Design a protein around this ligand. Sequence first.
Ligand code: NA
Ligand code: NA
Ligand code: ZN
Ligand code: ZN
Lengths: 91, 92
Amino acid sequence: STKLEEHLEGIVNIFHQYSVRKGHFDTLSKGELKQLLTKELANTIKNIKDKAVIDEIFQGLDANQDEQVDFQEFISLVAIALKAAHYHTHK
Amino acid sequence: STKLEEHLEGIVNIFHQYSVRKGHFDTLSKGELKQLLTKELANTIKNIKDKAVIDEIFQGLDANQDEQVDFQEFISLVAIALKAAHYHTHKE
Ligand code: NA
Ligand code: NA
Ligand SMILES: [Zn+2]
Ligand SMILES: [Zn+2]
């Protein structure tokens, strides 16, 4: 298992330590996602100098509350944070 | 600084360890990217049962082998790989 594979597993692991808490073990409510993002990306968020980017991380987490967040939807948010984090390494 | 942030940091580091080697420090050749994927995702690849997912990870890489690939293209592959990683934590 490479360092890259350990990071992928690590990201899955973080999703799961939230998703297992309530409801279906493999999804999150939008409320739980929002808590996850606010805490687990707190620095990434502080350092992002274009707030469109913040808004984009949080887009739609205050409506369609009946619809749950699966890992696929989480991957999309990870992709956004991975761009933000790259960019920050060049600041 | 959070554990999640460290994984993002690490993935960026890995990319950089290949992108810096030649020419522009922030892009790599499709050929270099094939080397990265084949080595850094070695076990991920074996565990993938779906040949189509494997072809998707290597899509486009043998044609235009000297074409430059940037971090964003690398993000797309990370996403594919993350889906596979997830799928595989649930293997029985
Ligand atoms: Na859940
Ligand atoms: Na390069
Ligand atoms: Zn899962
Ligand atoms: Zn870079």
